[PDB]
């Protein structure tokens, strides 16, 4: 059974900042002491996270 519930309470969520997080390895290659420029879907630095 799926029992109905309409007593949901709306509570305003907090807002905070993702300072230097949201980075991942974009592929499966090996590099050593190299600066590399990539274009992809990333989380912008100092963003607005819930």
């Amino acid at each position: 059974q799926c029992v109905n519930l309409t007593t949901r309470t709306q509570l305003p969520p907090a807002y905070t900042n993702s300072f230097t997080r949201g980075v991942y390895y974009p592929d499966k290659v090996f590099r050593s002491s190299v600066l590399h420029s990539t274009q992809d879907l990333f989380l912008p630095f100092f963003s607005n996270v819930t």
């Binding site: 499966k28 090996f30 050593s32």
Partner: protein, 50 residues
């Protein structure tokens, strides 16, 4: 036995050719569909599992 071939990744291939690996010879190589030519030598590089 029946085979279904649709717009799918088709992970079932089956038989394939195997070969022993040679070293210190300028040779043609094919690693997982990656084609190339050159001489292969032991490597001391530390990769990652992925």
């Amino acid at each position: 036995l029946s085979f279904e071939l649709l717009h799918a990744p088709a992970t079932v291939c089956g038989p394939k050719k195997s070969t022993n690996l040679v070293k210190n010879k300028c040779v043609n190589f094919n690693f997982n569909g990656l084609k190339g030519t050159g001489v292969l030598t032991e490597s001391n590089k530390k990769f990652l599992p992925f």
